[model samples]
Target chain A: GEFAQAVKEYAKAVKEYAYAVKEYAQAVKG
Target chain B: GEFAQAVKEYAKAVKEYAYAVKEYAQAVKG
Candidate 1:
């Protein structure tokens, strides 16, 4: 169902956003 | 600045999250 798809996509974005946040921290430290 | 990169990635996540939200409504409509 689209609900599952939406949840999956949202969760996937969380992972991506997490990594990007890490990168952001590194960039900040540099 | 690192700010720009962080902003870009956050916006990318925003796009995904935004689409996911739309899908959520679609699922509800079904």
Candidate 2:
């Protein structure tokens, strides 16, 4: 089903969130 | 403290995460 496509999108967003947080940590430290 | 600025950026990422999962929840719930 097309659910697969949406699932990928959701996962992407999750990764993006994690990546942003990681950078935010760097920023706070630096 | 400079922490305030970084926290705001982190907040934005959190908002993105919440919004993305909300969309995912709707897609899976239906």
Candidate 3:
């Protein structure tokens, strides 16, 4: 249910990167 | 970096409601 299935996988990836960016922003703020 | 970066787009598919299966278990127990 990952690494394939195109759209959903892409959506999941978006979430992953979004969280990554969000975490980075939090770190910068701290 | 996902379908060209769209937060609400990512939110569309696997949003909270769609994750009901995972949450339902938690809900049921607690």
Candidate 4:
């Protein structure tokens, strides 16, 4: 049940892919 | 953008969905 929510959050994250990668890089740099 | 904890960080992320989607759309268009 919890993972399901996480999965939905992740699905929303799919649409946020570019932002995710940009964030990942920024996190790495910062 | 650093707070990615979902429910644990929902307060900060709650109103942010609109922006996330909007930002995603803008970045895609821009």
Tell me, by DockQ, which candidate is best.
Answer: 1
Each candidate's DockQ = 0.41, 0.04, 0.07, 0.04
For each model in turn, which proportion of the native inter-chain contacts is also found? 0.37, 0.04, 0.09, 0.00
RMSD of each: 3.1, 18.1, 12.0, 9.3
**Ten contiguous residues minimizing lDDT sum, candidate 2 chain A:** A1-10
Interface RMSD score of candidate 3: 11.5
lDDT of 2 by residue, B1-30 (tens): 444544555556567777656655555555
Candidate 2 reaches a DockQ of 0.04
What TM-score does prediction 4 earn?
A: 0.32
Per-residue lDDT for B1-30 in model 1, tens only?
665775686688678778878877876799
Chain A of candidate 3: what's the TM-score?
0.73
Write the candidate numbers in order of decreasing DockQ. 1, 3, 4, 2
Candidate 1 positional error at B30, Å: 8.4
**lDDT values of the candidates?**
0.74, 0.58, 0.52, 0.55
Show where candidate 3 strays beyond 4 Å. Answer: A1-4, B1-30
lDDT for each residue of candidate 3 in A1-30, tens digit (9 for 90 to 100): 322346656677766655555455455445
Q: What is chain B's TM-score across the candidates, in the order shown?
A: 0.88, 0.76, 0.32, 0.43
Candidate 2, residue B15: how far the Cα is off, in Å: 0.7
Residue A2 local lDDT, model 4: 70
Return the clash pairs for model 4, or none. Answer: none
Which candidate model has the greater lDDT, 1 or 4? 1
Q: Candidate 3, overall lDDT?
A: 0.52
